[PDB]
Design a protein around this ligand. Structure first.
Ligand SMILES: CCCCCCCCCCCCCCCCCC(=O)OC[C@H](COP(=O)([O-])OCC(O)COP(=O)([O-])OC[C@@H](COC(=O)CCCCCCCCCCCCCCCCC)OC(=O)CCCCCCCCCCCCCCCCC)OC(=O)CCCCCCCCCCCCCCCCC
Ligand SMILES: CCCCCCCCCCCCCCCCCC(=O)OC[C@H](COP(=O)([O-])OCC(O)COP(=O)([O-])OC[C@@H](COC(=O)CCCCCCCCCCCCCCCCC)OC(=O)CCCCCCCCCCCCCCCCC)OC(=O)CCCCCCCCCCCCCCCCC
Ligand SMILES: CCCCCCCCCCCCCCCC(=O)OC[C@H]1O[C@H](O[C@@H]2[C@H](O)[C@@H](O)[C@H](O)[C@@H](O[C@H]3O[C@H](CO)[C@@H](O)[C@H](O)[C@@H]3O)[C@@H]2OP(=O)(O)OC[C@@H](COC(=O)CCCCCCCC[C@H](C)CCCCCCCCCCC)OC(=O)CCCCCCCCCC)[C@@H](O)[C@@H](O)[C@@H]1O
Ligand code: HAS
Ligand code: HAS
Ligand SMILES: CCCCCCCCCCCCCCCCCC(=O)OC[C@H](COP(=O)(O)OCCN)OC(=O)CCCCCCCCCCCCCCCCC
Ligand SMILES: CCCCCCCCCCCCCCCCCC(=O)OC[C@H](COP(=O)(O)O)OC(=O)CCCCCCCCCCCCCCCCC
Ligand SMILES: CCCCCCCCCCCCCCCCCC(=O)OC[C@H](CO)OC(=O)CCCCCCCCCCCCCCCCC
Ligand SMILES: CC(C)=CCC/C(C)=C/C=C/C(C)=C/C=C/C(C)=C/C=C/C=C(C)/C=C/C=C(C)/C=C/C=C(\C)CCC=C(C)C
Ligand SMILES: [Ca+2]
Ligand SMILES: [Cu+2]
Ligand SMILES: [Mn+2]
Lengths: 100, 63, 143, 57, 129, 216, 574
């Protein structure tokens, strides 16, 4: 423990190493929000589709705007959080020069 | 190759025996038994085809 | 237990977000072919499903900040690391079958709703559970 | 000071602890007879008495 | 392992301590008497025939069981080979011991492969000599 | 604390009146159940008749004779006449204990057939189905009881031998440096120099099967 | 990395004897007191298939009655009870128990543990599930028969007013006893994976099967107690004078929402483990590792996460649910299933496929479930569901998905792990016969029911007129249904014969290229599953154990355009 040791010519499977991104909570939370973001895409599609046949005439702008707002906040949150969770991996790749 | 011919032929008449009886009897309880005879014929047909499949591409090479 | 403590955060946040989205949606969208108004069944289920996954995740994380670098989680561990006692495991026991039968008797009792069957079922059930829990601690025969 | 059952294993709290609601020194469940024991033991140390017995013919 | 009053200790571990083996003829006799009684049951004053279906099914299964117990047929152990499985004369190498010793199935690995398993060949050159 | 035979609400006897649940006492229900399951076979011979209830008398008498004369029909097939003073554990005598459970299920089927009027009323199974359950069960259920009881007894004594030749399985599992998962067994008798128990001969006395039964 | 010195006169451990050599009485008391995960899993599997045959007999009776117009030998009541009990036993007594049986046998071998976390709890789960099964089936002994309200048990039809008779109650208890049996099985599988993993087996070196079982464990723990609460509420309304499910309280839609919130995760619980079983089978017989491993893990977790939001697409014709939201979510849940399909065909891409029996079953499962899910997408859109809902189109859809994911893939799993479970190999010829019979009989039975569903035949119809215009299609369905019934004869005979006289297994992996850890140990395993643990270093312990010379290739060709990271300098010191 406390440090790894690889000889030249040896390539391991990278997962669950101390530098791995799967081992940290930011990444998984970002996956959750990234999945959530597609709901806003569905919402805006529902709004404009209902508009296409002359329905939802009294609220369709609000539904489209709130769908887009939720989508953009969720997707940017997921992307940023994922990148934060992957920062240790980038530092390790700078450190060692091995990708796996 | 092999038994698959006869196992098919034995079925082909039994299936013919089934459907004929099905078109003979009216809507009745015996129509159920006619369906069973017909399906038994179909099963022996596929049984012949499956032994043929095993003979064409064996995967248990040594008897 | 690091990875599994933290991978539970995706399902729980997704369920919570769906719960809030759904509550706002059903309380506002007056679409034809449906009736406006918040529905409590479904929303309660979503929030308490998020609750279940959050309970699991938070307990596992709260525990995992205590434990050491176990060899099963160390990516280059040797088979000699885990040498020693793994733990105690029950070799055999008749009591799972007995208490399954007791629960069956109780269930049949509430089927017909004969009160004596319910009472005898509950008594038999706690008896069998107690015998299960005291199996490896019954005193030696007192002479 | 508090009482301690002598079956309790000895340890130094200053560098660890024996068992808590969250963590323990075992992967599975602890031994009902004490993890500090070292089974097996001798025949006479077992306390068992095997009976010789015969029946009529 | 000795035989006591007709039964082997391997089949009945307490064969010497009591009454263990009923003769197969007795089992047959009891079964046939039971079948005769259960076929007699269907000569009473009952009118329906659901009773008959139950009786006839159970007696048919009784007779099937009694016939197989009478003859006790057998099949042979099949001697085919299905896949990379090997015939009965095979000897299985301890792959784990070979892995942990670089001997047997893990012996004579080249330098590249030894590096591929995080083992420097310098610590192994004499072992493969 | 429990009422029994509340006669005050049954009224006095007169031969024209009867109740749905009118079974005899519990210890007589078997001889009621016999009368319920006999399939009405009656003989007519000119000026005479043997009623259908003579056969239950014959059956119950045979049932009582078998119980009365049991030790001698045990002798004739067991092939011994020794002066035993030590008891047999029932697991070690699978034939007799299997016949005992067989007789128990026979007696219980007779009993519940005697009480089937109440059983069908309460648990909602058809009354004809209960009589036929009694009839066919008095043949079939004894056989199933014999089979299961015999195999269970053999399994019990196999567990006894397993302990006596390998020692108690504590349940403490430990991993060796090779990764092999081993369970430390605690011997009862001496151990060979290879480090494993020497088997003890079974003696008919109970074998301890856990470590809480050695004081630990 | 350490290399040990040689041992003087070493001999491999005595691997256990195969099955069929057992003495008299060698399993009775062992069975009654069992707390071994693997024997217990075998009996799980046998009991589940017993219930499978029992339910399928009722299915064949249904088909025989619908062969022609007019009620030939069933009434309306008997037909109703038949489809109710067929659905209930096939979903709850076959499917979920077979899932937990395969989990109990395989998962400790895959994660390199000796036993499950809680043995007696596992035995309790088995026995209580069988108790629930017998309670559920006891309804037929009632003079009035068993429950008759469909496997969903919609209200007010299940009210005390509208469903008297004790069979309706026995269903409720039989289901509940089954549900807690499932929960007791799940408590183990989470705790086991969390606490008993082998050294060096990090979480992302687990096989895909145990990942699916993990996700299914959390999903099942979410949803079984909700069923128990709803069911106890219904029994409370029935036996006492309760009013919670009264229609004037909104009880009908309350029950529908609560039940289907339970029920759609149940179908995903049946779905994921068999996806995992084929995800283990396909890499072995194509001699290629699993394609997109962590991608498949993310897809499985995505299915688990989406299953909880999809539930109300079973109610598009109720006029109560919000259509666009649930239609969008049940479109989203198609994506990871398609990812899994793409990964399967990808790992098969330019492989060396050998066609032993489990590979045949796996490709058959893929072919069937493709059309099943393709039909499910059509059911997902409301405007098509307005016509399709609760018709024979729905029947064909869920029989495609269930018969594909459960029956085909469970048979694949049985053939795959029969060596490891018995120490003997199944008859190949009987296996092919069984496969072709089941395949042709199935597609004959259920492909034509799409058309009767479209033409207008509703589900659960016991009798129909000659003038309606769909008698010939039912006749074609019925003949191939009897063929489906006949198909299981070779399966039963093959299992029976192979158990007691089958080909003995010598090597640890008769298929040759087993990737997962259970193929490194003996056939059968010892009592505690492992006489020695390999050096676990990837998702293929057994493969890299048995083929050391392949390792340098296996680590190098893994990624398209793989980086130069093999040439990177040394990183530390011992
Ligand atoms: C030709 C017909 C067969 C034949 O050879 O008959 C003559 C042949 C003469 O004896 P044998 O030649 O030495 O062979 C004897 C056995 O057949 C040789 O086989 P076996 O010795 O293995 O078979 C023995 C069998 C032979 O007998 C039979 O098969 C029976 C018929 O007898 C038994 O198994 C004992 C039956 C005992 C019945 C009574 C049990 C009472 C239990 C009481 C429990 C407590 C209950 C309490 C009350 C309830 C409350 C809970 O057999 C007989 O005479 C007996 C069968 C007729
Ligand atoms: C409830 C039972 C309460 C206890 C009753 C009792 O003591 O019965 C003992 C009595 C026999 O006790 P025993 O003499 O110690 O049995 C050992 C055998 O003599 C000798 O050992 P064995 O290896 O023959 O073990 C018995 C059994 C093996 O043990 C069992 O079958 C146990 C089943 C327990 C669950 C209940 C199922 C109903 O194997 C066989 O009988 C031959 C193969 C059977 C398979 C063919 C039928 C398959 C139907 C389902 C379709 C296949 C699905 C795929 C399966 C793939 C598996 C790799 O009856 C039973 O054990 C019945 C179970
Ligand atoms: C699981 C399988 C379950 C099958 C479906 C359940 C229904 C059972 C069934 O199929 O019953 C037939 C139907 O008629 C029954 O009465 C019979 C005539 O039909 C009826 O017109 C007459 O009116 C009855 O005659 C007298 O009796 C009446 C009262 O009964 C009085 O009004 C009056 O006195 C009248 O004159 C006559 O009565 P039986 O008792 O003679 O006939 C019962 C029996 C007849 O079938 C057979 O012989 C089948 C032979 C094959 C044996 C195997 O059918 C059954 O039970 C058995 C059906 C077999 C199903 C097994 C499938 C195998 C599955 C594997 C596990 C009646 O019960 C209806 O309810 C029922 O729908
Ligand atoms: C194991 C058991 C089951 C599985 C698996 C299953 C899968 C699905 N089902 Fe289902 N089903 C429904 C929808 C789906 C969807 C969307 C999927 C998904 O798993 C399907 C995804 C699977 C695939 C295999 C996808 C295709 C694969 C690929 C690779 C391409 C990706 C997809 C693309 C590109 C989109 C498709 C493109 C197009 C152009 C169409 C709906 C409603 O949307 C109902 C209720 C209808 C009603 O009115 O009652 C329903 C009803 C049932 C019932 C009803 C029981 C009863 O009523 O009593 C059962 C038991 C059942 C079981 C199962 N079902 N299903
Ligand atoms: C896992 C889930 C399921 C499987 C598998 C399954 C298999 C079949 N199904 Fe189905 N089912 C239908 C037809 C079939 C047929 C022909 C088979 C086949 O797999 C059956 C053949 C397979 C067998 C396996 C039986 C052969 C038995 C033999 C050959 C011998 C028996 C004797 C013995 C002694 C057995 C040996 C015993 C030993 C112990 C060794 C039909 C229509 O043709 C409907 C709709 C009808 C309506 O109107 O609502 C239906 C309804 C349902 C429902 C909805 C119920 C409801 O709406 O309430 C569900 C959830 C469901 C699930 C499942 N079903 N099915
Ligand atoms: C019923 C009638 C069909 C019976 C099968 C006839 C075809 C056959 O024998 O296929 C053998 C094949 C095994 O593969 P292989 O030996 O390579 O043969 C194909 C290239 N000659 O068999 C297979 O690959 C079968 C695999 C399952 C296919 C399921 C398709 C749905
Ligand atoms: C201190 C203790 C209290 C237990 C229940 C009493 C019965 C009761 O409540 O009745 C009213 C009760 C009526 O319902 P309730 O008033 O709603 O509770 O009875 C029933 O519902 C059950 C009917 C049972 C029928 C039994 C049939 C005969 C069984 C014979 C068994 C013989 C066994 C032989 C064994 C021999 C070897 C030992
Ligand atoms: C012990 C019980 C013996 C019952 C004999 C009935 C003979 C009879 O009164 O038989 C007369 C009766 C007519 O016979 C039948 O029902 C034929 C079957 C009789 C029993 C065969 C066993
Ligand atoms: C009063 C007092 C004193 C007391 C109480 C009352 C009384 C007296 C009582 C008495 C009782 C008794 C003694 C009883 C007895 C009984 C008995 C012994 C019985 C017997 C029976 C038998 C039988 C029925 C048998 C049968 C058999 C059979 C069926 C067989 C079969 C076989 C086969 C089929 C083979 C194969 C197997 C299987 C399938 C399982
Ligand atoms: Ca009809
Ligand atoms: Cu669904
Ligand atoms: Mn509807």
């Amino acid at each position: 423990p406390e440090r790894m040791h690889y000889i030249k010519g040896y390539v391991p499977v990278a997962y669950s190493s101390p530098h791995s991104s799967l081992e940290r909570s930011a990444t998984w939370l970002g996956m959750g929000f990234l999945l959530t973001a597609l709901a806003g895409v569905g919402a805006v599609l529902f709004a404009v589709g209902a508009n296409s046949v002359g329905q939802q005439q009294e609220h369709w702008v609000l539904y489209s705007i709130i769908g887009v707002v939720f989508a953009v906040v969720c997707t940017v949150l997921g992307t940023v959080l994922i990148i934060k969770g992957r920062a240790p991996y980038n530092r390790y790749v700078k450190e060692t020069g091995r990708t796996q | 190759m092999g038994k698959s011919f006869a196992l098919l032929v034995l079925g082909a008449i039994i299936l013919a025996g089934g459907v004929w009886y099905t078109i003979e009897v009216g809507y009745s309880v015996m129509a159920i038994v006619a369906a069973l005879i017909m399906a038994a014929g179909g099963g022996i047909i596929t049984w012949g085809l499956a032994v043929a499949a095993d003979v064409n591409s064996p995967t248990s090479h040594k008897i | 237990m690091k990875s599994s403590a933290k991978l539970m955060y995706g399902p729980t946040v997704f369920m919570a977000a769906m719960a809030v989205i759904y509550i706002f949606a059903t309380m506002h969208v007056s679409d034809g072919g449906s009736v406006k108004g918040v529905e409590w069944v479904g929303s309660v289920a979503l929030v308490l499903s998020a609750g279940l996954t959050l309970m699991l995740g938070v307990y596992l994380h709260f525990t995992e900040v205590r434990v050491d670098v176990l060899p099963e989680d160390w990516e280059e561990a040797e088979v000699a690391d885990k040498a020693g006692t793994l733990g105690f495991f029950s070799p055999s026991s008749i009591w799972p079958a007995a208490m399954s039968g007791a629960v069956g008797f109780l269930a049949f009792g509430v089927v017909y709703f004969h009160y004596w069957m319910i009472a005898v079922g509950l008594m038999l059930l706690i008896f069998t559970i107690t015998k299960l829990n005291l199996q490896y601690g019954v005193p030696k025969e007192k002479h | 000071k508090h009482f301690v059952d002598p079956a309790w294993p000895e340890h130094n709290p200053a560098d660890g602890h024996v068992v808590t609601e969250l963590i323990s020194k075992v992967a599975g469940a602890s031994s009902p007879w004490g993890d500090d024991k070292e089974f097996p033991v001798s025949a006479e140390e077992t306390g068992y008495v095997h009976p010789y017995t015969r029946i009529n013919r | 392992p000795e035989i006591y009053r007709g039964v082997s200790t391997l089949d009945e571990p307490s064969a010497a301590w009591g009454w263990h083996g009923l003769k197969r003829n007795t089992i047959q006799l009891a079964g046939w008497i039971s079948v005769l009684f259960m076929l007699g049951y269907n000569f009473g004053n009952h009118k329906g025939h659901v009773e008959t279906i139950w009786l006839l099914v159970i007696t048919a299964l009784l007779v099937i069981g009694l016939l197989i117990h009478l003859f006790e047929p057998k099949l042979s152990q099949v001697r085919t080979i299905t896949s990379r499985n090997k015939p009965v004369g095979h000897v299985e190498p301890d792959w784990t011991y070979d892995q942990a010793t670089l001997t047997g199935t893990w012996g004579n690995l080249t330098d590249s492969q030894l590096r591929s398993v995080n083992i420097e060949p310098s610590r192994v050159a004499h072992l493969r000599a | 604390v429990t009422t029994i035979n509340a006669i005050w609400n049954l009224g006095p006897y007169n031969p024209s009146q009867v109740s749905a649940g009118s079974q005899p006492d519990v210890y007589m229900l078997w001889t009621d159940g016999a009368a319920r399951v006999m399939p009405a076979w009656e003989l007519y011979l000119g000026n005479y008749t043997i009623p259908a209830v003579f056969w239950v008398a014959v059956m119950l008498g045979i049932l009582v004779v078998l119980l009365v004369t049991y030790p001698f029909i045990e002798r004739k097939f067991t092939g011994d006449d020794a002066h035993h003073n030590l008891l047999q554990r029932p697991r070690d005598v699978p034939v007799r204990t299997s016949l005992g459970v067989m007789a128990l299920v026979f007696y219980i089927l007779l009993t519940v057939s005697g009480g089937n009027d109440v059983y069908a009323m309460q648990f909602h199974v058809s009354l004809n189905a209960m009589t036929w359950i009694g009839r066919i069960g008095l043949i079939v259920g004894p056989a199933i009881a014999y089979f299961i009881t015999y195999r269970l007894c053999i399994g019990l004594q196999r567990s006894d031998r397993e302990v006596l030749e390998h020692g108690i399985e504590t349940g403490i599992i430990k991993q060796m440096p090779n990764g092999a998962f081993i369970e430390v067994h605690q011997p009862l008798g001496p151990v060979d120099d290879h480090g494993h128990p020497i088997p003890l001969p079974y003696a008919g006395a109970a074998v301890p099967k856990q470590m809480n039964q050695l004081g630990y | 990395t350490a290399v040990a010195p040689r041992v003087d006169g070493h001999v491999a451990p005595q691997r256990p004897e195969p099955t069929g050599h057992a003495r008299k009485g060698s399993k009775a008391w062992l069975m009654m007191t069992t707390t071994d995960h693997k024997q217990l899993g075998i009996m799980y599997i046998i009991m589940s298939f017993s219930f499978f045959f029992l339910g399928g007999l009722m299915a064949l009776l249904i088909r025989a009655e619908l062969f022609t117009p007019g009620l030939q030998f069933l009434s309306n009541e008997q037909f109703n009870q038949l489809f109710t009990m067929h659905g209930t036993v096939m979903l709850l007594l076959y499917g979920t128990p077979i899932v937990w049986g395969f989990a109990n046998y395989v998962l400790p071998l895959q994660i390199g543990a000796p036993d499950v976390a809680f043995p007696r709890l596992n035995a309790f789960g088995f026995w209580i599930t069988t108790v629930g099964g017998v309670a559920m089936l006891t309804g037929f002994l009632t003079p009035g028969g068993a429950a008759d309200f469909g496997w969903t048990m919609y209200s007010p039809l299940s009210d005390a007013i509208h469903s008297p008779g004790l069979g309706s109650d026995m269903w409720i208890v039989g289901v509940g006893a089954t549900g807690i049996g499932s929960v007791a099985s799940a408590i183990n599988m989470l705790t086991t994976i969390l606490c008993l993993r082998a050294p060096g087996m990090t979480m992302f070196r687990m096989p895909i099967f145990t990942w699916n079982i993990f996700v299914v464990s959390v999903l099942a723990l979410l949803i079984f107690p909700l069923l128990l609460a709803a069911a106890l509420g219904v029994l409370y309304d029935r036996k006492l004078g309760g009013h919670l499910y009264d229609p004037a309280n909104g009880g009908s839609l309350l029950w529908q929402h609560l039940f289907w919130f339970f029920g759609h995760p149940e179908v995903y619980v049946l779905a994921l483990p068999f996806f995992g079983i084929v995800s283990e089978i396909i890499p072995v017989f194509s001699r290629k590792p699993m394609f997109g491993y962590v991608g498949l893990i993310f897809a499985t977790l995505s299915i688990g996460a989406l299953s909880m939001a999809v539930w109300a697409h079973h109610m598009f014709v109720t006029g109560a649910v919000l259509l666009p939201f649930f239609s969008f979510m049940t479109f989203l849940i198609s994506v990871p299933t398609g990812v899994k399909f793409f990964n399967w065909v990808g790992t098969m891409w330019k492989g060396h496929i050998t066609w032993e029996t489990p590979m045949i079953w796996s490709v058959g499962f893929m072919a069937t479930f493709l059309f099943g899910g393709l039909t499910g997408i059509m059911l997902a859109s409301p405007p098509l569901d307005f016509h399709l809902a609760d018709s024979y189109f729905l029947i064909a859809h869920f029989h495609y998905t269930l018969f594909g994911t459960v029956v085909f893939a469970s048979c694949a799993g049985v053939y795959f792990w029969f060596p490891k479970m018995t120490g003997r190999m199944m008859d190949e010829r009987l296996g092919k016969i069984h496969f072709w019979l089941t395949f042709v009989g199935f597609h004959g039975t259920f492909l034509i029911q799409h058309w009767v569903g479209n033409m207008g035949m509703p589900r659960r119809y016991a009798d129909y007129l000659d003038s309606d215009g769909f008698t010939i299609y039912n006749q074609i369905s019925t003949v191939f249904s009897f063929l489906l019934g006949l198909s299981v004869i070779p399966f039963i005979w093959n299992v029976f014969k192979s158990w007691r006289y089958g080909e003995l297994v010598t090597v640890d992996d008769p298929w040759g290229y087993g990737n997962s850890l259970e193929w490194a140990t003996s056939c059968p395993p010892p009592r505690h599953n492992f006489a020695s643990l390999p050096r676990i270093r990837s998702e293929r312990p057994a493969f890299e154990l048995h083929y050391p010379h392949m390792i340098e290739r296996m680590r190098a060709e893994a990624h398209t355009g793989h980086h130069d990271d093999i040439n990177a300098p040394e990183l530390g010191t011992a």
